[PDB]
Amino acid sequence: YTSAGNVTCWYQTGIVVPAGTPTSCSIMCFVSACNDFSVRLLKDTPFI
Amino acid sequence: YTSAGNVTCWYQTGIVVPAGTPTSCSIMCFVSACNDFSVRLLKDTPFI
Amino acid sequence: SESSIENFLCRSACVYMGEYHTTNTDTSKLFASWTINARRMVQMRRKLELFTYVRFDMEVTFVITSKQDQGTQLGQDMPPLTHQIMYIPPGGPIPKSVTDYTWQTSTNPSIFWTEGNAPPRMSIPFISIGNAYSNFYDGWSHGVYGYNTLNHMGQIYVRHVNGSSPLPMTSTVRMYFKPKHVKVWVPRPPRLCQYKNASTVNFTPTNITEKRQSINYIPETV
Amino acid sequence: RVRSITLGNSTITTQESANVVVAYGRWPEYLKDNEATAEDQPTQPDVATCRFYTLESVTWERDSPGWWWKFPDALKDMGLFGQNMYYHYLGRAGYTIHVQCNASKFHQGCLMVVCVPEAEMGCSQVDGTVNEHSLSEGETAKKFASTSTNGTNTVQSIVTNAGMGVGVGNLTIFPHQWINLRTNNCATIVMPYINNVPMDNMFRHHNFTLMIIPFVPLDYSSDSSTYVPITVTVAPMCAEYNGLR
Amino acid sequence: RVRSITLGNSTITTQESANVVVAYGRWPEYLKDNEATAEDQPTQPDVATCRFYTLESVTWERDSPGWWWKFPDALKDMGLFGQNMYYHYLGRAGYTIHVQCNASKFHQGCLMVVCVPEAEMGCSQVDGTVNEHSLSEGETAKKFASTSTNGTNTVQSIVTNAGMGVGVGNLTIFPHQWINLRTNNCATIVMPYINNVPMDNMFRHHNFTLMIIPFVPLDYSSDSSTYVPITVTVAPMCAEYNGLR
Amino acid sequence: RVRSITLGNSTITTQESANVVVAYGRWPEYLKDNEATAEDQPTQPDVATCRFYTLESVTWERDSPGWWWKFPDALKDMGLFGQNMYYHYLGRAGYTIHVQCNASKFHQGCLMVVCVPEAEMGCSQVDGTVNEHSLSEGETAKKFASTSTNGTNTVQSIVTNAGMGVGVGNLTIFPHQWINLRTNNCATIVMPYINNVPMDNMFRHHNFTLMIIPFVPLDYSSDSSTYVPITVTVAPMCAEYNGLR
């Protein structure tokens, strides 16, 4: 109900550690725009 | 009762690990021939 | 130099020995037949399995010996016997009696030979609508696993060339086969288990090698 | 020192320090033009066959004998490359296979990754015949066993004979790569099209077989993860079919 | 980044990133020709003296004070180089010494490896004299102690005075190398022949002494190995004897 | 692959593989000569302002929300640079900031290090005003909180709004650096002088604010150290004051 692309991530193997290291961990995502970005029709923002 | 050379392996020090790593381990051997190898008098093999 | 492909594979061997009579009451004992493949000779099979694709010509020589049956009748005076050796290409008519019409078809090449002379010999080219033969096929015939129809190589049939009401005789033929002008592709590991039948790769599990005393054991030096 | 590779609308990331095996020295390519000039005209998709397809990961535990896949038909449900398998009567293609592991410096183990042409397999019963389901299950892997198997119509899958009747230490004769958790975790194999005819039908013949086999089992200690994931990614190269017009 | 070195019928393997100390800037060499031209003609074996000889490994545990060897006569049972010690009345040689450790990234410790010329040692009794057995045992190492020793005819082997009456932190004045388990595990020292005469007899004089001394003791935790092995390998260089004809 | 840097009578050691952020592309420099030629003559100390000043380390534990410092007046007790703050009525300067961690390969965590110009902060009471002590304590760091604060005259220091009323994931708009314990442990930021006038008084205005914020908390297991130390070192650059003669 979007008509947009999507991204997903899957466990291929699983995480393997030696003795004496933390068990769980984390991933972080960063987003940005590439040089070819364009905008039109200045309007008012819906946040204030 | 061979008249052939031999190869042996000895522990010089012993294996040392930190905390949280497996204790035992393994070695593997690979064999091959070098370019100067020659053969003579085709015969029948003793395996089938 | 002795490990080249030609010197390793191009060698002659007896691959089929068969017996046939001039008169009998079975009518299948009146001729001998063989289908050409290289899977019922265990020593040639193993050397051929080191490769996945092969291409060769065939050369076949025939050694033929006769005998009068120990039945009863002696005092005979016979001329030397004549034999017919017929090759059938893939897609040819197969005889079912020794009196059949197919022993006279113009497209089945044939050899006529009489005893006392040098042994007969014919040369067959690479006969396949494919580009090579295959020793291994991971597929279905169209359904048999492991069998593809591009490996058909033909058949050989042998009979006596007498007239009507012949005298009783028994002959034995031995076929010697030799590949020539050989080319091979994609090497493979050597067969470790014994072969079980002639059409599959079936096997019973085998040990990797034989044991010794310990992982340190080296025998005392002379 | 990380490279990012995009094929079509797919993107994966590898390390630029990769090592690549080109199977027999031969890169994939089109059968050029004139083996069968007159009424044998081919076509090529080049649309969404050249793209990364990623299977499900497998789980490497302490007692894992190994895994195998058949090619093609591991891709018979994979988008367009699978559609082309049903629409066309003959085809051909080469492949690029990436295999990756996710492990730590506190794990240990060793894998062989090998691509075997014409891997004809034996039955568990010596006077029997193998079934079609026991040879492959598509994009799901079959498993080797650690002892000898039984039951009707099953491949005899004891891992020391690799289902082919040879010694498993000798499979290095084929295009292969080693993964030693100590020194690397990835392997790329580029396979060309290998047959004794130029084209063929892609449903009743298995061109080649991908096998993954642990030679030193996975080991870990106190509170590391108890498994390691393995991931396989495939990109078809220079695919080509019979023309339809 | 591994080099493989063959001397004679011996082969060992090292890392190409090795660091090498040439003792005082001087490589080994033959006394050229004409110190003693007329009736002093030498000969050189160059047969199986130039070859790697490997001693037994020693075991580094939590409380190890250190080890020492005397040169020569650590090689008086080593094949041909040892035969030549009995057949010839005078000789000389330089050496290459490799020292290696086998440890993990979960171990820690620090070793000094030093080659000391004329290492004359003191007795445990001030008005006593040292025995011949207490100075060396051939290819077996002697041990330093962590407290001061007693008994007759024994070297006073408290490790802080190194058996010579100096402060052990000052042995860096000699040709030496550090082994820090954190950053490297190997050490090569090339020693030339150093004497106040050109040749000498090899049985009643110890040219130099190799010492290995831990400055930070070995430490490990829960289920690592409890020891670390050290291995010593020696190759004689430019050996030369009195002529016999 | 270690560099040793000496400024004045100070010496610190860094790695030559460092990465350096120059804030907006602009290196620090003197306001050249002739903004205010006639009766505005400046002077420059260049004596013991160009020298490394090292604060106390902070302790990163499992639940640490973060730390912040104000510049200047984090240096109002730092030797000569602090004396010049009292003797002179106007000044200006740029800075070099080094941040370092001491951790092992068995630890894990992630820090943002950011330098924010004009970091005006909000009060914990919406109709209140912030105190001077709650904005800074000099060379001691203030602390962020993990929940919303109370009390009079205090900065509202919930860490997700960074005391400024923005989303903390968006502070990458400022000059910043990431420290991922897996890949590096150091960060250098070179800040120029940024104001809307050429000089200013250094006691009632905070030019910029240094913030250090963990985005993935510190984790360790069985018997590792339970904390990680962070160290901050500052060198003033091109400082300049009003002339006194």
Coordinates of N, CA, C and O in Angstrom, one line a residue, chain D residues 62-202:
Chain D
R62 N 28.6 -27.9 15.2 CA 29.7 -28.8 15.5 C 29.7 -30.1 14.7 O 30.8 -30.5 14.3
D63 N 28.6 -30.7 14.5 CA 28.5 -31.9 13.7 C 27.7 -31.6 12.4 O 26.5 -31.8 12.4
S64 N 28.3 -31.1 11.4 CA 27.7 -30.8 10.1 C 28.5 -31.6 9.1 O 29.7 -31.3 9.0
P65 N 27.9 -32.6 8.4 CA 28.7 -33.3 7.4 C 28.9 -32.5 6.1 O 30.0 -32.5 5.6
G66 N 27.9 -31.8 5.6 CA 28.2 -31.0 4.4 C 26.9 -30.7 3.7 O 25.8 -31.2 4.0
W67 N 27.0 -30.0 2.6 CA 25.8 -29.6 1.8 C 26.2 -29.6 0.3 O 27.3 -29.4 -0.1
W68 N 25.1 -29.8 -0.5 CA 25.3 -29.8 -2.0 C 24.1 -29.3 -2.7 O 23.0 -29.4 -2.2
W69 N 24.3 -28.6 -3.8 CA 23.3 -28.1 -4.7 C 23.6 -28.5 -6.1 O 24.7 -28.7 -6.5
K70 N 22.5 -28.5 -6.9 CA 22.6 -28.9 -8.4 C 22.3 -27.7 -9.3 O 21.4 -26.9 -9.0
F71 N 23.0 -27.6 -10.4 CA 23.0 -26.4 -11.2 C 22.8 -26.9 -12.7 O 23.6 -27.7 -13.2
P72 N 21.7 -26.4 -13.4 CA 20.8 -25.5 -12.8 C 19.7 -26.3 -12.1 O 19.9 -27.4 -11.8
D73 N 18.6 -25.6 -11.9 CA 17.4 -26.0 -11.1 C 17.5 -25.7 -9.6 O 16.5 -25.8 -8.9
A74 N 18.6 -25.2 -9.2 CA 18.7 -24.5 -7.9 C 18.1 -23.1 -8.1 O 17.9 -22.3 -7.2
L75 N 17.9 -22.7 -9.4 CA 17.4 -21.4 -9.8 C 16.1 -21.5 -10.6 O 15.8 -20.5 -11.4
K76 N 15.4 -22.6 -10.5 CA 14.2 -22.7 -11.3 C 13.0 -21.9 -10.8 O 12.0 -21.8 -11.5
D77 N 13.1 -21.4 -9.6 CA 12.2 -20.4 -9.1 C 12.7 -19.0 -8.9 O 12.1 -18.2 -8.1
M78 N 13.8 -18.7 -9.5 CA 14.5 -17.4 -9.3 C 14.2 -16.4 -10.4 O 15.0 -16.1 -11.3
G79 N 13.0 -15.9 -10.3 CA 12.6 -14.7 -11.1 C 12.7 -15.0 -12.6 O 12.1 -16.0 -13.1
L80 N 13.4 -14.2 -13.4 CA 13.4 -14.3 -14.8 C 14.2 -15.5 -15.3 O 13.8 -16.2 -16.2
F81 N 15.4 -15.7 -14.7 CA 16.2 -16.8 -15.2 C 15.4 -18.1 -15.1 O 15.6 -19.0 -15.9
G82 N 14.5 -18.2 -14.1 CA 13.6 -19.4 -14.0 C 12.5 -19.4 -15.0 O 12.1 -20.4 -15.4
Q83 N 12.0 -18.2 -15.4 CA 11.0 -18.1 -16.4 C 11.5 -18.6 -17.7 O 10.9 -19.4 -18.5
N84 N 12.7 -18.2 -18.1 CA 13.4 -18.6 -19.3 C 13.6 -20.1 -19.4 O 13.8 -20.6 -20.5
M85 N 13.7 -20.8 -18.2 CA 13.9 -22.2 -18.3 C 12.6 -22.9 -18.8 O 12.7 -23.9 -19.4
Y86 N 11.4 -22.3 -18.5 CA 10.2 -22.9 -19.1 C 9.9 -22.4 -20.4 O 9.2 -23.1 -21.2
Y87 N 10.2 -21.2 -20.8 CA 9.8 -20.7 -22.1 C 10.7 -21.3 -23.3 O 10.2 -21.4 -24.4
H88 N 11.9 -21.6 -23.0 CA 12.8 -22.0 -24.0 C 13.2 -23.5 -24.0 O 13.3 -24.1 -22.9
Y89 N 13.4 -24.0 -25.2 CA 13.7 -25.4 -25.3 C 15.2 -25.8 -25.0 O 15.4 -26.9 -24.6
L90 N 16.1 -24.9 -25.3 CA 17.5 -25.1 -25.1 C 18.1 -23.9 -24.6 O 17.6 -22.7 -24.8
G91 N 19.2 -24.0 -23.8 CA 19.9 -22.9 -23.2 C 21.4 -23.3 -22.9 O 21.8 -24.4 -23.1
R92 N 22.0 -22.3 -22.3 CA 23.4 -22.5 -21.8 C 23.8 -21.2 -21.0 O 23.2 -20.1 -21.2
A93 N 24.8 -21.3 -20.1 CA 25.2 -20.2 -19.3 C 26.4 -20.6 -18.5 O 26.6 -21.7 -18.2
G94 N 27.2 -19.6 -18.1 CA 28.2 -19.7 -17.1 C 27.8 -19.0 -15.8 O 26.7 -18.5 -15.8
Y95 N 28.5 -19.1 -14.7 CA 28.1 -18.6 -13.4 C 29.3 -18.0 -12.7 O 30.4 -18.4 -12.9
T96 N 29.0 -17.1 -11.8 CA 29.9 -16.6 -10.7 C 29.3 -17.0 -9.4 O 28.1 -16.6 -9.1
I97 N 30.0 -17.7 -8.5 CA 29.5 -18.1 -7.2 C 30.4 -17.5 -6.2 O 31.6 -17.6 -6.2
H98 N 29.7 -16.7 -5.2 CA 30.3 -16.2 -4.0 C 29.8 -17.0 -2.9 O 28.6 -17.3 -2.7
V99 N 30.8 -17.4 -2.0 CA 30.4 -18.1 -0.7 C 31.1 -17.3 0.4 O 32.3 -17.0 0.3
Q100 N 30.3 -17.0 1.4 CA 30.8 -16.2 2.5 C 30.4 -16.8 3.9 O 29.4 -17.5 4.0
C101 N 31.2 -16.5 4.9 CA 31.0 -16.9 6.3 C 30.9 -15.7 7.2 O 31.5 -14.7 6.9
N102 N 30.2 -15.9 8.3 CA 30.2 -14.9 9.3 C 30.7 -15.5 10.6 O 29.9 -16.2 11.3
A103 N 31.9 -15.2 11.0 CA 32.5 -15.8 12.2 C 33.4 -14.8 12.9 O 33.8 -13.7 12.3
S104 N 33.9 -15.1 14.1 CA 34.7 -14.3 14.9 C 36.2 -14.8 14.9 O 36.5 -15.9 14.4
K105 N 37.0 -14.1 15.6 CA 38.4 -14.6 15.8 C 38.5 -15.6 16.9 O 39.6 -16.2 17.2
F106 N 37.4 -15.9 17.7 CA 37.4 -16.9 18.7 C 36.8 -18.2 18.2 O 36.7 -19.2 19.0
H107 N 36.4 -18.3 16.9 CA 36.0 -19.5 16.3 C 37.1 -20.1 15.5 O 38.2 -19.5 15.3
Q108 N 36.9 -21.4 15.0 CA 37.9 -22.1 14.2 C 37.2 -23.2 13.4 O 36.3 -23.8 13.8
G109 N 37.8 -23.4 12.2 CA 37.3 -24.5 11.3 C 37.8 -24.3 9.9 O 38.3 -23.2 9.5
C110 N 37.5 -25.3 9.1 CA 38.1 -25.3 7.7 C 37.1 -25.9 6.8 O 36.5 -27.0 7.0
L111 N 36.8 -25.3 5.6 CA 35.8 -25.7 4.6 C 36.5 -25.9 3.3 O 37.3 -25.1 2.9
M112 N 36.1 -27.0 2.5 CA 36.4 -27.1 1.1 C 35.1 -26.6 0.3 O 34.0 -27.1 0.7
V113 N 35.3 -25.8 -0.7 CA 34.2 -25.4 -1.6 C 34.6 -25.8 -3.0 O 35.5 -25.3 -3.5
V114 N 33.8 -26.7 -3.6 CA 34.2 -27.3 -4.9 C 33.1 -27.4 -5.9 O 31.9 -27.6 -5.5
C115 N 33.4 -27.2 -7.2 CA 32.4 -27.2 -8.2 C 32.7 -28.4 -9.1 O 33.7 -28.4 -9.8
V116 N 31.8 -29.4 -9.2 CA 32.1 -30.7 -9.8 C 31.2 -30.9 -11.0 O 30.0 -30.9 -10.9
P117 N 31.7 -31.0 -12.2 CA 30.9 -31.3 -13.4 C 30.5 -32.7 -13.5 O 31.3 -33.6 -13.2
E118 N 29.3 -33.0 -14.0 CA 28.7 -34.3 -14.1 C 28.9 -35.2 -12.8 O 29.6 -36.2 -12.8
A119 N 28.3 -34.7 -11.7 CA 28.5 -35.4 -10.5 C 27.4 -36.5 -10.3 O 26.5 -36.4 -9.6
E120 N 27.6 -37.6 -11.1 CA 26.7 -38.7 -11.0 C 26.8 -39.5 -9.7 O 27.9 -39.8 -9.3
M121 N 25.7 -39.8 -9.1 CA 25.7 -40.3 -7.7 C 25.2 -41.7 -7.6 O 24.4 -42.1 -8.5
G122 N 25.6 -42.4 -6.6 CA 25.2 -43.8 -6.4 C 24.0 -44.0 -5.5 O 23.7 -43.2 -4.6
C123 N 23.4 -45.2 -5.6 CA 22.3 -45.5 -4.8 C 22.7 -46.2 -3.5 O 23.7 -46.8 -3.4
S124 N 21.9 -46.0 -2.5 CA 22.1 -46.6 -1.2 C 22.0 -48.1 -1.2 O 22.5 -48.9 -0.4
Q125 N 21.2 -48.6 -2.2 CA 21.1 -50.0 -2.5 C 21.8 -50.3 -3.8 O 21.6 -49.7 -4.8
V126 N 22.7 -51.3 -3.7 CA 23.6 -51.5 -4.8 C 22.9 -52.0 -6.1 O 23.2 -51.5 -7.2
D127 N 21.8 -52.8 -5.9 CA 20.9 -53.1 -7.1 C 19.7 -52.3 -6.9 O 18.6 -52.8 -6.8
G128 N 19.8 -50.9 -6.9 CA 18.7 -50.0 -6.9 C 19.0 -48.9 -7.9 O 19.9 -48.9 -8.6
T129 N 18.1 -47.9 -7.8 CA 18.2 -46.7 -8.7 C 17.7 -45.5 -7.9 O 16.9 -45.6 -7.0
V130 N 18.4 -44.4 -8.2 CA 18.2 -43.2 -7.4 C 16.9 -42.5 -7.9 O 16.5 -42.6 -9.1
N131 N 16.3 -41.8 -7.0 CA 15.0 -41.0 -7.2 C 15.4 -39.6 -7.6 O 16.5 -39.1 -7.5
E132 N 14.4 -38.9 -8.2 CA 14.6 -37.6 -8.6 C 14.6 -36.6 -7.4 O 15.4 -35.6 -7.4
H133 N 13.8 -36.8 -6.4 CA 13.8 -36.0 -5.2 C 15.0 -36.2 -4.4 O 15.4 -35.2 -3.7
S134 N 15.7 -37.3 -4.4 CA 16.8 -37.5 -3.5 C 18.1 -36.9 -4.1 O 19.1 -36.9 -3.5
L135 N 18.0 -36.5 -5.4 CA 19.2 -35.9 -6.0 C 19.2 -34.4 -5.7 O 20.3 -33.8 -5.6
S136 N 18.0 -33.7 -5.7 CA 18.0 -32.3 -5.4 C 16.6 -31.9 -4.9 O 15.7 -32.6 -5.1
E137 N 16.6 -30.8 -4.2 CA 15.4 -30.1 -3.7 C 15.4 -28.7 -4.1 O 14.7 -27.9 -3.4
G138 N 16.0 -28.3 -5.2 CA 15.9 -26.9 -5.7 C 16.8 -25.9 -5.1 O 18.1 -26.0 -5.2
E139 N 16.3 -25.0 -4.3 CA 17.1 -24.0 -3.7 C 17.4 -24.4 -2.3 O 18.2 -23.7 -1.6
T140 N 16.8 -25.4 -1.8 CA 17.2 -26.1 -0.5 C 18.3 -27.1 -0.7 O 18.3 -27.9 -1.7
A141 N 19.3 -27.1 0.2 CA 20.5 -28.0 0.1 C 20.1 -29.4 0.5 O 19.3 -29.6 1.4
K142 N 20.7 -30.4 -0.1 CA 20.8 -31.7 0.4 C 21.9 -31.8 1.4 O 22.8 -31.0 1.4
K143 N 21.9 -32.8 2.3 CA 22.9 -33.0 3.3 C 23.6 -34.3 3.1 O 23.0 -35.4 2.9
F144 N 24.9 -34.2 3.3 CA 25.8 -35.4 3.5 C 25.5 -36.0 4.9 O 25.1 -35.4 5.8
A145 N 25.8 -37.3 5.0 CA 25.8 -38.0 6.3 C 27.1 -38.4 6.8 O 28.1 -38.4 6.0
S146 N 27.2 -38.6 8.1 CA 28.5 -39.0 8.7 C 28.7 -40.5 8.8 O 29.8 -41.0 9.1
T147 N 27.6 -41.3 8.5 CA 27.7 -42.8 8.4 C 26.9 -43.2 7.2 O 26.3 -42.3 6.5
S148 N 26.9 -44.5 6.8 CA 26.3 -44.9 5.6 C 24.8 -45.0 5.7 O 24.3 -45.5 6.7
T149 N 24.1 -44.6 4.7 CA 22.7 -44.5 4.7 C 22.0 -45.7 4.2 O 22.6 -46.7 3.7
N150 N 20.6 -45.7 4.3 CA 19.8 -46.8 4.0 C 18.5 -46.3 3.3 O 18.4 -45.1 3.0
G151 N 17.5 -47.1 3.2 CA 16.3 -46.7 2.6 C 16.4 -46.8 1.1 O 17.5 -46.7 0.5
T152 N 15.2 -46.9 0.4 CA 15.1 -47.0 -1.0 C 15.3 -45.7 -1.7 O 14.8 -44.7 -1.3
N153 N 16.0 -45.8 -2.9 CA 16.0 -44.7 -3.9 C 16.8 -43.5 -3.4 O 16.8 -42.5 -4.0
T154 N 17.5 -43.6 -2.3 CA 18.3 -42.5 -1.7 C 19.8 -42.6 -2.2 O 20.3 -43.7 -2.3
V155 N 20.3 -41.5 -2.5 CA 21.8 -41.4 -2.7 C 22.5 -41.9 -1.5 O 22.1 -41.6 -0.3
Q156 N 23.5 -42.7 -1.7 CA 24.4 -43.2 -0.6 C 25.3 -42.0 -0.2 O 26.3 -41.8 -0.9
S157 N 25.1 -41.3 0.8 CA 25.6 -40.0 1.1 C 26.6 -40.0 2.2 O 26.9 -38.9 2.8
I158 N 27.3 -41.1 2.6 CA 28.4 -41.0 3.5 C 29.4 -40.0 3.0 O 29.8 -40.1 1.8
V159 N 29.9 -39.1 3.8 CA 30.6 -38.0 3.4 C 32.1 -38.3 2.9 O 32.6 -37.6 2.1
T160 N 32.6 -39.4 3.4 CA 34.0 -39.8 2.9 C 34.0 -40.3 1.5 O 35.1 -40.2 0.9
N161 N 32.9 -40.7 0.9 CA 32.9 -41.1 -0.5 C 32.2 -40.1 -1.4 O 32.1 -40.4 -2.6
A162 N 31.7 -39.1 -0.8 CA 31.1 -37.9 -1.5 C 30.0 -38.4 -2.5 O 29.7 -37.7 -3.4
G163 N 29.4 -39.5 -2.2 CA 28.3 -40.0 -3.1 C 28.7 -40.4 -4.5 O 27.9 -40.8 -5.3
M164 N 30.0 -40.4 -4.8 CA 30.5 -40.7 -6.1 C 31.4 -41.9 -6.2 O 31.9 -42.3 -7.3
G165 N 31.8 -42.5 -5.0 CA 32.7 -43.6 -5.0 C 34.2 -43.3 -5.1 O 35.0 -44.2 -5.4
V166 N 34.6 -42.1 -4.7 CA 36.0 -41.7 -4.7 C 36.4 -41.3 -3.3 O 35.5 -41.2 -2.4
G167 N 37.7 -41.1 -3.1 CA 38.2 -40.6 -1.8 C 38.0 -39.1 -1.8 O 38.5 -38.4 -2.7
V168 N 37.4 -38.6 -0.7 CA 37.0 -37.2 -0.6 C 38.2 -36.2 -0.5 O 38.1 -35.1 -0.8
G169 N 39.4 -36.8 0.0 CA 40.6 -36.0 -0.1 C 41.1 -35.7 -1.5 O 42.1 -35.0 -1.6
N170 N 40.6 -36.3 -2.5 CA 41.1 -36.1 -3.9 C 40.2 -35.2 -4.7 O 40.4 -35.1 -5.9
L171 N 39.2 -34.6 -4.1 CA 38.3 -33.7 -4.9 C 39.0 -32.4 -5.3 O 38.4 -31.6 -6.0
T172 N 40.2 -32.1 -4.9 CA 41.0 -31.0 -5.3 C 41.4 -30.9 -6.7 O 41.8 -29.9 -7.2
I173 N 41.2 -32.1 -7.5 CA 41.3 -32.1 -8.9 C 40.3 -31.3 -9.6 O 40.5 -30.9 -10.8
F174 N 39.2 -30.9 -9.0 CA 38.2 -30.0 -9.5 C 38.4 -28.6 -9.1 O 39.2 -28.3 -8.2
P175 N 37.8 -27.6 -9.8 CA 37.9 -26.2 -9.3 C 37.3 -26.0 -7.9 O 36.2 -26.3 -7.6
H176 N 38.2 -25.5 -7.0 CA 38.0 -25.6 -5.6 C 38.6 -24.4 -4.9 O 39.4 -23.7 -5.5
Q177 N 38.2 -24.2 -3.7 CA 38.8 -23.1 -2.8 C 38.7 -23.5 -1.4 O 37.7 -24.2 -1.0
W178 N 39.6 -23.1 -0.6 CA 39.7 -23.4 0.9 C 39.2 -22.2 1.6 O 39.6 -21.1 1.3
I179 N 38.5 -22.4 2.7 CA 38.1 -21.3 3.6 C 38.6 -21.7 5.0 O 38.0 -22.6 5.6
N180 N 39.6 -21.1 5.5 CA 40.2 -21.3 6.8 C 39.8 -20.1 7.7 O 40.3 -19.0 7.4
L181 N 39.0 -20.4 8.7 CA 38.5 -19.3 9.5 C 39.5 -18.4 10.1 O 39.2 -17.2 10.5
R182 N 40.7 -18.8 10.2 CA 41.9 -18.1 10.7 C 42.4 -17.1 9.7 O 43.0 -16.1 10.2
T183 N 42.2 -17.2 8.4 CA 42.9 -16.4 7.4 C 42.0 -15.7 6.4 O 42.4 -14.7 5.9
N184 N 40.8 -16.3 6.1 CA 39.9 -15.7 5.2 C 38.5 -16.3 5.5 O 38.3 -17.3 6.2
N185 N 37.5 -15.6 4.9 CA 36.1 -16.2 5.1 C 35.3 -16.1 3.8 O 34.1 -16.2 3.9
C186 N 35.9 -16.0 2.6 CA 35.2 -15.9 1.4 C 35.8 -16.6 0.3 O 37.0 -17.0 0.3
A187 N 35.0 -16.9 -0.8 CA 35.5 -17.7 -1.9 C 34.7 -17.4 -3.1 O 33.4 -17.4 -3.1
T188 N 35.3 -17.1 -4.2 CA 34.7 -16.8 -5.5 C 35.2 -17.8 -6.5 O 36.4 -18.0 -6.7
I189 N 34.2 -18.5 -7.2 CA 34.5 -19.4 -8.3 C 33.7 -19.0 -9.5 O 32.5 -18.8 -9.5
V190 N 34.4 -18.8 -10.7 CA 33.8 -18.4 -11.9 C 33.8 -19.7 -12.8 O 34.9 -20.2 -13.2
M191 N 32.6 -20.2 -13.1 CA 32.5 -21.4 -13.9 C 32.0 -21.1 -15.3 O 31.0 -20.5 -15.5
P192 N 32.6 -21.6 -16.3 CA 32.1 -21.6 -17.7 C 31.1 -22.7 -18.0 O 31.0 -23.6 -17.1
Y193 N 30.5 -22.7 -19.1 CA 29.6 -23.7 -19.6 C 30.5 -24.9 -20.2 O 31.3 -24.7 -21.1
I194 N 30.2 -26.1 -19.6 CA 31.0 -27.3 -20.0 C 30.1 -28.4 -20.3 O 29.3 -28.9 -19.5
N195 N 30.1 -28.8 -21.6 CA 29.2 -29.9 -22.1 C 29.9 -30.5 -23.3 O 30.9 -30.0 -23.8
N196 N 29.4 -31.6 -23.7 CA 29.9 -32.2 -25.0 C 29.0 -31.8 -26.1 O 29.2 -32.3 -27.2
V197 N 28.0 -31.0 -26.0 CA 27.3 -30.3 -27.1 C 27.2 -28.9 -26.8 O 27.3 -28.4 -25.6
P198 N 26.9 -28.0 -27.8 CA 26.9 -26.6 -27.6 C 25.7 -26.1 -26.8 O 25.9 -25.1 -26.0
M199 N 24.5 -26.6 -27.0 CA 23.4 -26.2 -26.1 C 22.7 -27.5 -25.6 O 23.1 -28.6 -26.0
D200 N 21.8 -27.3 -24.7 CA 21.1 -28.5 -24.1 C 19.8 -28.0 -23.4 O 19.6 -26.8 -23.3
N201 N 19.0 -29.0 -23.0 CA 17.8 -28.7 -22.3 C 18.1 -28.7 -20.8 O 18.9 -29.5 -20.3
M202 N 17.5 -27.7 -20.1 CA 17.9 -27.4 -18.7 C 17.1 -28.1 -17.6 O 17.2 -27.7 -16.5

